[PDB]
């Protein structure tokens, strides 16, 4: 039920609401390799929903303190990559003063989401191939999923019914987990 090692991939402020700084951050799970270097976590399928939630909760609390932000949004991605080369594993928005994003809301925590588990090395590889190859499979402004699924399947020598960008959708997570 503890937070996992993470590294930010993107950080940006939003000051649209006068006197209420928002800080939006995208994070990924990391691990140490044999050489002691940090890399994108190879397999997160054994990471629980509770651990994914604890990671975004801890990151939100960290950034609120460090950037002196009134509001902090954290998105945990499956791995580094383009928009369609990764998926959301967990999310959390934190407003320490209990006034939400607007400054007149009545919440401290919102947009609490976490997938039931992380992804396997194979699921992560499929996502990476999806992101790299999809540009060659554009037909009338949309991805030809049938042909993209088949080309990944042929490359990895696996069935096409195992090929998808999002193998596991996020779920809400309880408010009591943030206490």
UniProtKB/TrEMBL annotation:
DUF4875 domain residues: 44-165
Domain of life, source organism: Bacteria
Name of the protein this chain belongs to: DUF4875 domain-containing protein
Species per Swiss-Prot/TrEMBL record: Desulfovibrio piger ATCC 29098
Species lineage: Bacteria, Pseudomonadati, Thermodesulfobacteriota, Desulfovibrionia, Desulfovibrionales
């Amino acid at each position: 039920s503890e937070a996992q090692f993470f590294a930010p991939t993107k950080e940006s402020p939003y000051e649209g609401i006068p006197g209420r700084l928002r800080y939006n951050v995208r994070i990924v799970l990391v691990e140490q390799d044999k050489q002691g270097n940090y890399i994108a976590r190879r397999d997160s399928s054994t990471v629980s929903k509770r651990q994914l939630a604890a990671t975004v909760i801890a990151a939100a609390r960290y950034y609120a303190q460090e950037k002196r932000a009134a509001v902090v949004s954290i998105t945990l991605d499956s791995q580094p990559g383009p928009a369609f080369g990764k998926t959301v594993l967990a999310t959390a928005t934190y407003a320490p003063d209990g006034k939400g994003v607007s400054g007149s809301d009545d919440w401290t925590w919102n947009t609490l989401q976490a997938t039931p588990r992380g992804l396997t090395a194979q699921e992560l590889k499929i996502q990476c191939l999806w992101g790299e190859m999809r540009g060659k499979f554009q037909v009338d402004g949309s991805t030809d999923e049938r042909r993209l699924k088949a080309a990944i399947a042929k490359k990895l020598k696996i069935p096409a019914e195992k090929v998808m960008l999002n193998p596991v959708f996020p779920e809400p997570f309880p408010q009591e987990w943030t206490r």
